[PDB]
Design a protein around this ligand. Structure first.
Ligand SMILES: Nc1ncnc2c1ncn2[C@@H]1O[C@H](COP(=O)(O)OP(=O)(O)O)[C@@H](O)[C@H]1O
Ligand SMILES: Nc1ncnc2c1ncn2[C@@H]1O[C@H](COP(=O)(O)OP(=O)(O)O)[C@@H](O)[C@H]1O
Ligand SMILES: [Mg+2]
Ligand SMILES: [Mg+2]
Lengths: 220, 220
């Protein structure tokens, strides 16, 4: 199944969601994480680096922490300017047909790669935050979803209180809410998924519940 | 420069030394880790798995945590069986040619891959514990070094007291003694080097001093 994480505004926790949700899913099922953002955030969250070579989409992958990560590369940049969304879409589907779950990380916009990842996604997932820029972003994403006729789940990040906006009929706001935590910044200094770092840093993990509920909700 | 970690008995810290020392050398210089153990200890130590493909020696490499790790693969099992020591040696020289430091993990024996990595190693290091069978292994390694005309540096693991033996004119015993540490098991369970774990696990780095010292003892 294809899980695409969408948000036209950066810093909302999109890469964190892709990385940690893919890792949580890897535990019982064969999971891949395809990194479509040229920044390569999700590539960095697995201890790696953006390839400074213009590579074909999906040709290269490395299995880190039992996740098949397709690392980011500068080839995306050209795709992200003059790409053919049908061909990237078919490529994403052809890769996903080898995984129980393919989580896709998208660049901070709604361009060619975001459209490619959205039209073939089985589920679209948007993080949301209380500051007003993410609120304008999610409202515009609802118009995106309608004009393409697609759904998207949403969940609240960087907060203790859950964010809900009820005129958005193509965005279902779940109850899931993730508060700030040392774990994210520490694991990012490490360059590992936050869940995996939690597995050994503390005894009773608290981050696993968020991504567990996210997985259960999208699996419906 | 090529560094080969050698030991006949498993469980002394061979992989742990390879991983941590290579990561330490990556701080300033271009460093590679060649995993020649078919079991893939160092490979696991970087969050990867051994390839179930018969790859050629030193073709797959991933940059994990600033280190060019060459993962273990079943092809090693072929080379360990009937590999020509000379050809394996020349290959290892090719692999290490482009690296300021090439650290090599070896299997728990003195077989084909191990002898091939010693015959070309610029320096050879052999961890020792105060365990009877490890004390025996260092004597056997002194024997094999004499048979092939090479030297090795030893240091103590799993102990606060340094181990030293007499009439082993081929192994220099250094004052470096590494004490037990929870950080080691935790970096194992997480799957990263321990010097990178303690980079965030604490505030005043502790384990890096021993590799700081070991680099100095083996560089002069
Ligand atoms: N719930 C959270 N609590 C604390 N820090 C977070 C949280 N979510 C994300 N971060 C931090 O925000 C930074 C950037 O977030 P990221 O996931 O890259 O967002 P995006 O990819 O959408 O820009 C990361 O360093 C991450 O550690
Ligand atoms: N100083 C230490 N204190 C505690 N545990 C250690 C120490 N050094 C290594 N270990 C643990 O011992 C286990 C085996 O060590 P390893 O280096 O793989 O042995 P080998 O030399 O057989 O490869 C690893 O799980 C590692 O975490
Ligand atoms: Mg990002
Ligand atoms: Mg081992």
């Amino acid at each position: 199944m294809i899980v695409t994480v969408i948000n036209q505004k950066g810093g909302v926790g999109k890469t964190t969601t892709s990385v940690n949700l893919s890792y949580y899913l890897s535990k019982e099922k064969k999971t891949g994480l395809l990194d479509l953002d040229p920044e390569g955030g999700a590539t960095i969250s697995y201890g790696m680096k953006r390839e400074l070579k213009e590579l074909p989409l999906g040709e290269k992958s490395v299995n880190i922490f039992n996740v098949e990560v397709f690392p980011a590369h500068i080839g995306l940049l050209k795709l992200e300017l003059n790409g053919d969304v049908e061909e990237i879409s078919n490529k994403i589907k052809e890769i996903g047909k080898q995984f129980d779950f393919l989580v896709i990380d998208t660049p901070p916009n709604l361009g060619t790669l975001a459209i490619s990842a959205m039209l073939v996604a089985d589920r679209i997932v948007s993080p949301v935050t209380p500051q007003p820029l993410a609120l304008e972003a999610i409202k515009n994403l609802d118009s995106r979803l309608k004009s393409i006729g697609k759904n998207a789940y949403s969940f609240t990040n960087f907060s203790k209180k859950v964010v809900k906006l009820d005129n958005l009929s193509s965005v279902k706001f779940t109850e899931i809410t993730i508060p700030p935590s040392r774990l994210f910044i520490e694991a990012s200094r490490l360059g590992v998924p936050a869940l995996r770092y939690e597995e050994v840093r503390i005894k009773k993990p608290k981050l696993a519940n968020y991504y567990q509920q996210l997985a259960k909700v999208i699996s419906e």
